[PDB]
Design a protein around this nucleic acid. Structure first.
Lengths: 58, 70, 128, 58, 178
RNA sequence: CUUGAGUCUCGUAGAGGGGGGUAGAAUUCCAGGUGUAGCGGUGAAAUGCGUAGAGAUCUGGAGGAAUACCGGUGGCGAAGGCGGCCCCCUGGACGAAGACUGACGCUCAGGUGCGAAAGCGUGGGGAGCAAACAGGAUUAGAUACCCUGGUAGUCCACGCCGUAAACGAUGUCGACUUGGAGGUUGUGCCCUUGAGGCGUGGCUUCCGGAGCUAACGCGUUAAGUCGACCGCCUGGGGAGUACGGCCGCAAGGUUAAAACUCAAAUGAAUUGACGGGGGCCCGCACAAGCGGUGGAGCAUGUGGUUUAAUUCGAUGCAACGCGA
RNA sequence: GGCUGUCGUCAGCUCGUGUUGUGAAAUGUUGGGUUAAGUCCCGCAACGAGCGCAACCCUUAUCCUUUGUUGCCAGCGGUCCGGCCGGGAACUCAAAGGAGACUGCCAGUGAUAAACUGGAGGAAGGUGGGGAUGACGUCAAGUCAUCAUGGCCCUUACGACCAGGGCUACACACGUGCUACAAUGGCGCAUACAAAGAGAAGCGACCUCGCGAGAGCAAGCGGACCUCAUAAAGUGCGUCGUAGUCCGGAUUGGAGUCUGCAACUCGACUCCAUGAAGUCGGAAUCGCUAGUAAUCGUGGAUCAGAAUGCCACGGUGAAUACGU
RNA sequence: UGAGCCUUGAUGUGUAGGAUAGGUGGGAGGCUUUGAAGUGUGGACGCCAGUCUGCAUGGAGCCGACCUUGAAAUACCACC
């Protein structure tokens, strides 16, 4: 079961990132963990709809 | 088995092709080997047997003209 | 055995022509220089080159055997040569070069390797 | 092993009676896709019309 | 193996004299990557040599590189129940380097109170064919005259050879059916 | 009757059978000549032979199995079987004209005759090689294999039970089924334009069509279409032994089985692996090289080993500065 | 389940479809020539097409192009000759569009040919250097300890707070890396230029104390301005001879310092004195085709307190690749 | 052909040493074409080409006392 993940090397050109924001190093973890919490608890609410992607921007 | 028939022009290297006609074969070839009585008729006498690979080759020449490989 | 002799000048009978005999086995060559009338004037071997194994039975050991004996007989004063060959083993040609390199002519390379009229039965060896 | 265009991969995780099941799905829409593309201009034509410096002279 | 022909690097004249034949010498004089020292050791040796004979600083270096030069090599490639040795005549790039290696191999044990002197003594010596690497030459050609006996899995190779427009005799050389 | 077959003389190819004659070459041997330090064996090696003169080599004689050469897809026999050259006795098959008989035919239990090979009794013969046997070598085990010593045997003559994979494991003989060509021969014809061409027989063989096979293969010499008659087989293991009849101085031979166990065994082919069968290709896989760790000291991980416990994960390449 | 490793950069593997066999399955996926290539010339029941590779891609190298500072400075000014500053654009130089190179040209070779090599301008001729980059998937490889999770057990606990102790143990062996065993160096004194990145919770010039580490104060910062940082190896001069030294400097005593209630086994740093093993190491044992290998130092990721390690960077930079 | 007795003749390729180490006395060198040596000719003579060396011609050298290495020292004649 081979290969570095196929979409992962594509993330810098003609594929967008799944999230786009910037925090100046020291606050980057605090912003990354909140960016996860919005992913996890928001999708729980829209359970009954059908959705392909989630894109969070600050 | 430098073979008693003399090579055309004598030189330090014996011309083994030009020398043999029926020497060493069957008589002095199976040295330190088990002697059979009737196996040699089919075992050693393989002149028809060795011609077949040459025939196979001479057949495939023609087919290479017809395929346009040639 | 050999002695530490001063440089050689010596004369014996100055016979000028000889026959050589090469007895080729699987493990060795015995190379033996004779008078035309047929008398040992000297010999050397492949086995005293002390290679052991299969390695004693190679054309280069056949060459140097020829070169020792052909050398020694320069005191016997041979100047031309003929050889009889007796075995199916290697040094077919490289033995012939050492007799020529001793500065002798070697025009008659008579193989006499004897084919009996179906003689005595050989050891059976491997069952293939 | 392609770097160019977006190309869609998903690995699903889902449950059934006997435990977790999963499907790995690559789908390929096109080798040129315009859904994310590089910016309209290079630096050299962009922004101010008179761009050359005084080259000192405070 | 090897699909196509693959090349070699080329040495570009050294920064303190301007010679290719010197920039290749300093490359094997290198210990711990340090060519910029191996330069300092060549030029300090060469000048001591230059007091010994003033007609050229390169006198005793240039003739060392001819006299201790091996002309022949012995190669090795195992066959089954046997290792053997099989002689080849050697290509010039390795004739030159063997001799450069051997001048420096001998120098680092000369024990003299500066390496510039160690290298300068072994060159004055190998120029006159009196030094340490005359022996290294002698041995390497002995092996190449002695090992003319052997062939590669020989007993079957000797028919295989005879039909491939080869001789009725054992070829003492690498990677041929012999 | 001839449409089956049988017969007389003529011709032809061949190692068919049985008894006689006959030369030369190695080992082996006796004698004589020449000559000095190893020979032999094998992966490597030892046992074996040698300075008491080996080993090798030359000259002359010796003896016996055997006949190296016909050597090719040839030809002959009975399958197995047959190879030096001649002579004597003589079989069987292949041709051809002249000619004759006229179902005189097919098959064959029983049957009598008859051996590849070794086994084998007496006589003859005996040179090498060799089961066993012995010892080395292997450790890989049986004194086996493998190597060296080494015997019966192998070899002929007559004689005893005729064994097997006993052969195209293709019964016998006969009728029918597109052919060309090889090898090579009777014989009709040809400048025999090339082991050539055609007419028509001969064994022997390559190719392939109808038909026949599970598959390879066979294919006019069938394993096709068939004919009669005979021979033999009916799951494995255990059994080519046991049992009965019968033969053999004698060791042995001959047809040839069940209880019981058991759900399989067996012909073949695909593809991987694999060959110690043959060959090709590629990777820093080797070569062509250079440096690095093991050893020192330290740093760190692993296990050994320790306690209350010194926690686990990874362990041939897919492990140890790696999950941690 | 999600995910990844092995083979292996093997150079092959598969989808759609026909045909040949009764079918398992072949064929293509095999051949000749050629390669990094199922790349490309030729061609048979393989036709059509995809996967790996090839490519786009980022980066680097010159170099085209715009900016002109916290960047640069042929010339000019204060001037230690530092862009600190009056000023200046000849010039790297930085982040960004990217340019160039395609066996396309020309020649030789190769079956036309892919392609190998040579020519030439250019930094560079052979998909320019470097990376990304990994077929279907057996190996039942490994994680229930990222996490999903059925089966399935405790839930006064296979939960929790608090503390101490351990893997960092010692009889040893072994895997790895470091640095060394010299003089190519080390000693003393003098001497030179880095790249890249870190510094918002943080670091930090000058400061005064201190042998240093550090101390306590603090302008300043947003990092091409200030600082980590003296980059080291390398060079200069004079000096050293196998004696474990003039290499190597470990240990250990002792004092100063640090992060923290708390430094004992188990923490860091400075530094004084004395001063060992080890002279390239048996068995074992690995990466490498060139910016590589080797070797030297740096910073950062992590980061209470601790790097030999990992990641990247720059210094200095190797033998050879005949041949299968 | 052993042994005894006896006439002369030599090699000594050392760890350290330029090479020439059987024990050891005489004893401080032979200048004779330089004792030489040297291509070249022969001879004693061996851990195999090495020590010594006769001589047309050759004033070119063993090698010590010395110079030098070692436990012992070396010329050259003897003794064995």
């Amino acid at each position: 079961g081979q290969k570095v993940h196929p979409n992962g090397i594509r993330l810098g050109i003609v594929k967008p990132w799944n999230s786009t924001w910037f925090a100046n190093t020291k606050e980057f973890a605090d912003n990354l963990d909140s960016d996860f919490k919005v992913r996890q608890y928001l999708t729980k609410e829209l359970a009954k709809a059908s959705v392909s992607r989630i894109v969070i921007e600050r | 088995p430098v073979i008693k028939v003399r090579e055309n022009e004598p030189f330090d290297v014996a011309l083994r092709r030009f020398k043999r006609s029926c020497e060493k074969a069957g008589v002095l070839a199976e040295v330190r080997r088990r002697e059979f009585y009737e196996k040699p008729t089919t075992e050693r006498k393989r002149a028809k047997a060795s011609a077949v690979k040459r025939h196979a080759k001479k057949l495939a020449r023609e087919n290479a003209r017809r395929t346009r490989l040639y | 055995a050999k002695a530490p002799i001063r440089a050689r000048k010596r004369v014996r009978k100055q016979v000028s022509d000889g026959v050589a005999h090469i007895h080729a086995s699987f493990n060795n060559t015995i190379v033996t220089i004779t008078d035309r009338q047929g008398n040992a004037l000297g010999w050397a071997t492949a086995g005293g080159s002390g290679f052991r194994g299969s390695r004693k039975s190679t054309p280069f050991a056949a060459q140097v055997a020829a070169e020792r004996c052909a050398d020694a007989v320069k005191e016997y004063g041979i100047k031309n040569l003929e050889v009889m060959v007796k075995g199916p083993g290697p040094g077919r040609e490289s033995t012939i070069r050492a007799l020529n390199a001793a500065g002798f002519r070697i025009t008659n390379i008579t193989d006499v390797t004897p084919i009996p009229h179906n003689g005595c039965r050989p050891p059976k060896k491997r069952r293939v | 092993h392609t770097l160019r265009a977006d190309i869609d991969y998903n690995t699903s995780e889902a449950h059934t009676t006997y435990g977790v099941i999963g499907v790995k799905v690559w789908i390929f829409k096109g080798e040129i896709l315009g859904g994310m593309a590089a910016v309209e201009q290079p630096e050299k034509p962009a922004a101010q019309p008179k761009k050359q410096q005084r080259k000192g002279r405070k | 193996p090897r699909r196509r022909v693959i090349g070699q690097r080329k040495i570009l004249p050294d920064p303190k004299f301007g010679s290719e034949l010197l920039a290749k010498f300093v490359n094997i004089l290198m210990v711990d990557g340090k060519k910029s020292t191996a330069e300092s050791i060549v030029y300090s040796a060469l000048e001591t040599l230059a007091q010994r004979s003033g007609k050229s600083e390169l006198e005793a270096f240039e003739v060392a590189l001819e006299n201790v030069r091996p002309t022949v090599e012995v190669k090795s490639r195992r066959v089954g129940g046997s290792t053997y040795q099989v002689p080849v005549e050697v290509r010039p790039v390795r004739r030159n380097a063997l001799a450069m290696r051997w001048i420096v191999e001998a120098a680092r044990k000369r024990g003299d109170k500066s390496m510039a002197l160690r290298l300068a003594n072994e060159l004055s010596d190998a120029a006159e064919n009196k030094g340490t690497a005359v022996k290294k030459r002698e041995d390497v050609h002995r092996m190449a005259e002695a090992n003319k006996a052997f062939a590669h899995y020989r007993w079957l190779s000797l028919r295989s050879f005879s039909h491939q427009a080869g001789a009725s005799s054992k070829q003492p050389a690498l990677g041929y059916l012999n």
